[PDB]
């Protein structure tokens, strides 16, 4: 029969320590994409983020919008603006990230650095430079 | 705030898919003697070791099986022959799956490293053992 569950404070009291995962932040994955073409990406841990992300990118409209899809323990957040998609994936267990505020800062720095060259580039054409920018916003 | 919809409304009935854990939603797993960790494996980054040692310092040596809860998480452990097998999941993880995983882990660690466990240094089974912890 399954073992008891007790509060950890019953062993260590009120100073029981707290887990801070993923640097204190909820975003595991972010991409800049145009339609199904990913221009830049960054993962904060290992996961099969790409495959499902492309599935979403292929189904969503290209009109301006903002939306969150939920699945299991994750939320997939995006802003689409001028056919360009800014997307990030959050882990529901982790400490609160302001997903839309991050995507907005990402978009701004992407629109500034590249602007409408995003409209044209090959898959991954900005990955080397912009990846570390994605890692640094956060 | 943008609206939140289920992903199945966009994609249809998906199936399994996202794994910080190339499979099972276990975030961390460890084998320890008192506070000496012998082998460990993490599925993402964070302060698992510092937190886990605080718990291990206080878990007694007697045979026992138990889950502690704290915040969003569950710490499940089996202590047998003074060795603790511990894993961390979230709150929504089916607890019987944690113990069946830890029981599998204990069996192999017993078979392989007999009672060298009582004297082995920190991390002395880590290269070999982490990639069996990894494979569930
Ligand atoms: Cl915690
Ligand atoms: Cl949200």
Author numbering:
A (entry chain B): 20 to 157
B (entry chain A): 21 to 156
Please share excerpts from the published article on this structure:
Vesicle-associated membrane protein 7 (VAMP7), also known as tetanus neurotoxin-insensitive VAMP (TI-VAMP) or synaptobrevin-like 1 (SYBL1), is an R-SNARE that has been implicated in several fusion events, some likely to be in all cells and others occurring at specialized sites in particular types of differentiated cells. VAMP7 and yeast Nyv1p (Wen et al., 2006), along with the yeast and mammalian orthologs of Sec22 (Gonzalez et al., 2001) and Ykt6 (Tochio et al., 2001), comprise the “longin” subfamily of R-SNAREs because they possess a 120–140 residue N-terminal, profilin-like, longin domain (Filippini et al., 2001) that is also found in other proteins including the σ and μ subunits of the AP2 clathrin adaptor complex (Collins et al., 2002) and the SRα subunit of the signal recognition particle receptor. We demonstrate that the clathrin-mediated endocytosis of the SNARE VAMP7 is directly mediated by Hrb, a clathrin adaptor and ArfGAP.
In order to increase artificially the apparent concentration of the two components and thus make crystallizing a complex of the two more likely, a cDNA encoding the fragment of Hrb mapped as binding VAMP7 longin domain (residues 136–176) was cloned onto the 5′ end of the VAMP7 longin domain cDNA. Following removal of the GST tag, this chimeric construct was crystallized and its structure was determined by SIRAS with a single mercury derivative (Experimental Procedures), because attempts to solve it by molecular replacement using a variety of profilin-like fold proteins as search models failed. The chimeric construct crystallized with four molecules in the asymmetric unit, with the fragments of Hrb binding to each longin domain in an identical manner but with two being intermolecular and two being intramolecular interactions. The first 20 residues of the Hrb fragment (residues 136–155) are disordered, and only residues 156–176 are visible in the density. These sit in a hydrophobic groove that wraps halfway around the longin domain and have assumed short stretches of defined secondary structure on binding the longin domain. Residues 156–159 of Hrb form an additional β strand along one edge of VAMP7 longin domain strand β3. The Hrb short β strand then gives way to a single-turn α helix (residues 160–167) that is flanked by proline residues, and contacts the longin domain via hydrophobic interactions using predominantly three leucine residues. Residues 168–176 of Hrb pack against helix α1 of VAMP7 longin domain, with the interaction again being mediated by hydrophobic side chains and also one hydrogen bond between Asn24 of VAMP7 longin domain and Thr170 of Hrb.
